[PDB]
Amino acid sequence: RPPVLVDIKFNPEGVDRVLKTAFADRGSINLADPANRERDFSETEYALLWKPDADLFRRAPNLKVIFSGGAGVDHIIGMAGLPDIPIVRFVDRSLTTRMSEWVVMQCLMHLRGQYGHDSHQRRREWAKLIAPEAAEVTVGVMGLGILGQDAVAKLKVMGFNVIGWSRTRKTIEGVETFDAGELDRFLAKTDILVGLLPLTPETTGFYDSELFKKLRRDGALGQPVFINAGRGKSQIETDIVSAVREGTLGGASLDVFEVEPLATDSPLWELENVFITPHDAAVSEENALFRHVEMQIARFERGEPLQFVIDRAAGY
Amino acid sequence: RPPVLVDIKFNPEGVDRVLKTAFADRGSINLADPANRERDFSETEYALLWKPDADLFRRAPNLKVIFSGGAGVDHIIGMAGLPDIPIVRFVDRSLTTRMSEWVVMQCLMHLRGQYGHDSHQRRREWAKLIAPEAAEVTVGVMGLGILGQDAVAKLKVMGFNVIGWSRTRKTIEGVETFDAGELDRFLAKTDILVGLLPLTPETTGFYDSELFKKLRRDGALGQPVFINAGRGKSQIETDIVSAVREGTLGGASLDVFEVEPLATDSPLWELENVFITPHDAAVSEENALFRHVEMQIARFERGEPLQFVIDRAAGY
Numbered sequence: 001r002p003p004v005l006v007d008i009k010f011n012p013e014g015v016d017r018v019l020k021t022a023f024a025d026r027g028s029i030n031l032a033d034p035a036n037r038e039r040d041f042s043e044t045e046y047a048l049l050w051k052p053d054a055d056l057f058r059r060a061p062n063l064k065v066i067f068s069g070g071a072g073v074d075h076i077i078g079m080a081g082l083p084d085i086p087i088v089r090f091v092d093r094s095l096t097t098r099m100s101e102w103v104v105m106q107c108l109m110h111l112r113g114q115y116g117h118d119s120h121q122r123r124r125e126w127a128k129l130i131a132p133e134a135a136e137v138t139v140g141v142m143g144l145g146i147l148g149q150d151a152v153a154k155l156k157v158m159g160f161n162v163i164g165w166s167r168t169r170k171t172i173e174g175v176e177t178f179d180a181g182e183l184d185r186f187l188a189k190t191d192i193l194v195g196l197l198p199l200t201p202e203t204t205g206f207y208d209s210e211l212f213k214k215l216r217r218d219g220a221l222g223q224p225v226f227i228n229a230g231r232g233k234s235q236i237e238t239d240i241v242s243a244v245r246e247g248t249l250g251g252a253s254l255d256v257f258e259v260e261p262l263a264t265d266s267p268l269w270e271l272e273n274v275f276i277t278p279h280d281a282a283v284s285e286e287n288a289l290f291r292h293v294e295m296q297i298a299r300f301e302r303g304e305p306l307q308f309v310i311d312r313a314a315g316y
Numbered sequence: 317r318p319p320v321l322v323d324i325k326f327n328p329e330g331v332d333r334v335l336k337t338a339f340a341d342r343g344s345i346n347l348a349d350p351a352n353r354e355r356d357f358s359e360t361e362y363a364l365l366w367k368p369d370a371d372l373f374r375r376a377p378n379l380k381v382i383f384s385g386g387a388g389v390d391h392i393i394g395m396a397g398l399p400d401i402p403i404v405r406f407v408d409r410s411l412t413t414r415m416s417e418w419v420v421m422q423c424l425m426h427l428r429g430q431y432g433h434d435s436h437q438r439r440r441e442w443a444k445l446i447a448p449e450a451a452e453v454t455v456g457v458m459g460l461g462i463l464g465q466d467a468v469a470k471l472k473v474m475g476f477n478v479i480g481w482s483r484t485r486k487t488i489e490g491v492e493t494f495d496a497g498e499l500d501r502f503l504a505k506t507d508i509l510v511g512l513l514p515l516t517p518e519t520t521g522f523y524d525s526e527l528f529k530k531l532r533r534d535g536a537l538g539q540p541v542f543i544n545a546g547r548g549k550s551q552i553e554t555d556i557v558s559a560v561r562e563g564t565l566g567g568a569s570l571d572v573f574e575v576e577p578l579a580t581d582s583p584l585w586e587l588e589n590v591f592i593t594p595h596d597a598a599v600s601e602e603n604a605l606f607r608h609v610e611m612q613i614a615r616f617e618r619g620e621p622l623q624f625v626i627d628r629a630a631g632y
């Protein structure tokens with residue numbers, strides 16, 4: 001069997017380490033090594049890709065399966081000469097639970113005025129800040145897939161009122177849900193918006209001034225909050241800045257940005273009640289991805305269906 | 317029936333407001349009002365107390381029941397002339413769920429390096445910080461009462477490994493528990509210590525250097541973390557400062573202090589990876605306290621047992 005082509009432009013040291021023992025039955029070709037840049041890899045069957053080279057499918061034109069290095073596949077969709085073959089994304093219990101850690105933490109920090117507590121602490125000021133309890137606040141989760149459903153369940157346990165939005169209607173016990181055409185209804189009920197959407201043409205430039213002005217205004221936190229850990233190109237950052245400055249948004253938590261790393265001169269870094277994390281909301285341990293690809297290759301090759309295959313028509 | 321004596325030294329404006337409609341069948345005497353302070357209230361049956369006047373029981377010597385304004389009663393225990401009558405503490409679903417919000421938030425902020433993320437954000441630095449998932453970390457909850465059991469359940473849902481310590485043995489499904497004599501076993505397994513103990517003579521000056529040096533050292537967060545939302549006099553703050561500076565503790569979250577408000581010259585304010593909240597972890601609305609006292613008076617007066625009565629021998 002030919003080696004697995006690996007073009008993963010994150011944590012190159014971690015990738016190099018794991019590849020020493022990964023795909024033991026065939027080996028790998030790591031495009032992080034500049035010497036592999038011009039290699040003849042025309043017989044490659046499997047490629048593992050994160051922000052891959054734009055010409056990758058010219059250079060590997062006989063692929064059987066494409067594996068994403070993440071849960072998102074927007075870096076692969078739209079590539080030139082993308083073959084009509086399965087694209088398998090990364091879905092993993094550890095990834096999922098880490099995203100829910102981040103979501104719940106951010107929701108609690110907004111509920112409990114972490115920003116204000118930290119500001120007072122820095123000034124050595126003792127100031128009790130009256131917080132509503134979680135049940136007085138509605139968290140609206142946009143995206144009810146692997147990540148969204150886990151976050152919904154854990155937010156509910158913490159005591160938040162939770163509602164959900166997704167493309168097609170969902171049934172989730174104890175959680176009012178809304179489909180694509182019911183976006184405005186959902187927004188009107190939401191105090192804390194949590195974004196867990198994939199990036200598609202339908203979700204690009206989606207979180208804008210008009211949407212922020214539809215969020216609930218007379219809620220227990222006073223002003224609504226925007227949280228996004230999906231994709232940065234789903235939001236309009238200039239609109240986030242203006243909304244926070246104006247009081248349309250009371251605050252935000254952002255793990256993802258229109259261009260990453262977030263530019264040093266962005267106003268977002270020092271906005272009051274805004275939390276920034278550097279696209280690290282759900283970083284699953286380096287080996288879990290590779291064990292996952294190995295498993296799917298094994299299933300594929302012995303006649304079991306591939307799992308976590310994206311819907312090409314839907315684009316995720 | 318004589319009016320209820322109220323000496324609650326928190327949120328005096330909120331107390332005055334709620335008292336306008338509380339105890340509708342008998343009224344109240346609020347010692348916040350100077351005109352009440354030297355009145356003859358010798359026939360008082362019920363007193364509601366939070367940081368009360370030291371001479372209160374000389375001035376109200378015929379009490380039938382004492383109600384604490386909080387879940388803790390250490391402010392009442394040890395008062396001069398404390399009568400041999402039931403002391404009823406505040407137990408309330410809103411209080412409980414708010415404490416669990418705080419506990420879970422603090423545990424997540426330590427798990428996910430909130431302090432480090434915030435420090436970088438303030439410097440406009442994009443810097444991924446590798447976090448373990450919750451299941452790689454053991455949270456040891458000290459105190460398995462109303463607050464402890466709620467926190468244990470929610471921490472487990474978030475994915476932490478959770479163990480518990482209490483005076484007498486508990487049975488909690490999926491949670492290894494330890495009794496008084498097993499303290500050292502419990503400490504050795506604990507990466508994040510969560511304090512939800514009452515203040516008694518047995519728990520005074522309890523969280524000290526010796527105890528911090530028994531916490532687990534080779535865990536996924538690197539160094540162990542001390543979280544306390546019980547009582548400030550249970551900790552030795554000089555030892556917390558030295559432990560954090562020396563790397564015995566990786567960080568801390570403290571809602572309670574030996575002397576409150578925390579002095580402006582405390583070294584705690586500026587210690588790296590230390591979060592300070594001003595004894596506001598679980599602040600239930602005043603209405604809930606007053607509805608609670610009304611309920612217990614009603615039960616008492618129609619022959620039903622008082623609930624939430626402290627054990628004088630145990631001291632809580």
Ligand SMILES: NC(=O)C1=CN([C@@H]2O[C@H](COP(=O)(O)OP(=O)(O)OC[C@H]3O[C@@H](n4cnc5c(N)ncnc54)[C@H](OP(=O)(O)O)[C@@H]3O)[C@@H](O)[C@H]2O)C=CC1
Binds near residue numbers: 070148180196256
């Ligand atoms: N910040 C980080 O570290 C990470 C970010 N992510 C991001 O999270 C995203 C979500 O992951 P995951 O939950 O596994 O994906 P899923 O495919 O499992 O779920 C996606 C959800 O989004 C909904 N959705 C998609 N398009 C639309 C639309 N046009 N209108 C309304 N709803 C829509 C889907 O609706 P329906 O159910 O009807 O199909 C589905 O509920 C990833 O695509 C990735 O970009 C992922 C991992 C880590």
Ligand SMILES: NC(=O)C1=CN([C@@H]2O[C@H](COP(=O)(O)OP(=O)(O)OC[C@H]3O[C@@H](n4cnc5c(N)ncnc54)[C@H](OP(=O)(O)O)[C@@H]3O)[C@@H](O)[C@H]2O)C=CC1
Binds near residue numbers: 387389458519
């Ligand atoms: N920061 C804040 O805003 C707040 C702080 N608090 C504090 O939290 C404390 C706990 O409240 P709550 O859960 O309702 O109280 P409980 O009486 O319900 O539970 C107390 C727990 O502590 C255990 N305990 C007591 N003494 C010891 C000891 N010497 N060794 C080991 N375990 C011991 C008890 O053990 P066992 O089960 O064997 O009896 C019990 O599990 C309050 O007393 C108060 O000081 C409360 C409210 C808000």
